[PDB]
Design a protein around this ligand. Structure first.
Ligand SMILES: *[C@@H]1O[C@H](CO)[C@@H](O[C@@H]2O[C@H](CO)[C@@H](O[C@@H]3O[C@H](CO)[C@@H](O)[C@H](O)[C@@H]3O)[C@H](O)[C@H]2NC(C)=O)[C@H](O)[C@H]1NC(C)=O
Ligand SMILES: *[C@@H]1O[C@H](CO)[C@@H](O)[C@H](O)[C@H]1NC(C)=O
Ligand SMILES: *[C@@H]1O[C@H](CO)[C@@H](O)[C@H](O)[C@H]1NC(C)=O
Ligand SMILES: *[C@@H]1O[C@H](CO)[C@@H](O)[C@H](O)[C@H]1NC(C)=O
Lengths: 48, 45, 28
């Protein structure tokens, strides 16, 4: 979908994210709902 | 319906899930994959 | 929360490595 700041890259339901952790020694996979936060330049408001 | 910001014309129609006496009528779909490798899933004998 | 700098102009150097079929690079 679209961000409230008219940007692109928001996923509106369950997302699968693959993250490397601990200096590239662990690979994790989270299937979680990704909610935007409301902080300045932090996925909230009209400035992003 | 306004999903995500897009217009979606939908339609919902209900039905009775179970009979009068209280027996739930299920539908079970079972898909079995026969592959060329070793067969893991087995019946318990 | 964190002010970052986004500038894709410096991120365009190519050094391409295309797929070589004779080595089976991406064959599953
Ligand atoms: C699938 O599951 C059923 C139920 O768990 C298994 O049937 C059970 O089989 C055992 C032994 O074959 C039975 O135990 C026997 O019980 C009688 C009294 O009921 C007792 O006198 C004997 O000494 C013995 O302990 C058990 O009753 C029986 N249960 C039922 C509900 O039939 C069945 O064997 C399983 N299939 C397999 C493992 O392939
Ligand atoms: C996707 O997210 C919306 C946001 O509320 C939710 O209503 C919907 O149920 C979600 N999709 C599924 C399949 O649960
Ligand atoms: C991303 O950056 C490139 C590099 O200038 C640009 O050509 C492209 O239009 C940008 N895309 C978006 C969606 O901002
Ligand atoms: C593919 O790899 C082989 C093995 O080194 C090499 O001989 C060949 O030239 C390569 N092909 C290309 C198109 O790079």
């Amino acid at each position: 979908g679209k961000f409230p700041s008219n940007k692109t890259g928001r996923y509106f339901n369950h997302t699968l994210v693959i993250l490397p952790e601990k200096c590239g020694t662990q690979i994790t996979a989270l299937y979680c709902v990704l909610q935007p936060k409301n902080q300045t330049n932090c996925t909230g408001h009209t400035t992003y | 319906y306004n999903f995500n910001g897009r217009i979606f014309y939908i339609g919902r129609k209900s039905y009775t899930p179970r009979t009068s006496e209280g027996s739930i009528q299920m539908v079970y779909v079972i898909t079995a994959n026969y592959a060329e490798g070793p067969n893991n899933v087995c019946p318990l004998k | 929360c964190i002010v970052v700098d986004m500038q894709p102009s410096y991120f365009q150097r190519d050094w391409p490595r295309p797929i070589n079929m004779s080595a089976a690079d991406g064959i599953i």
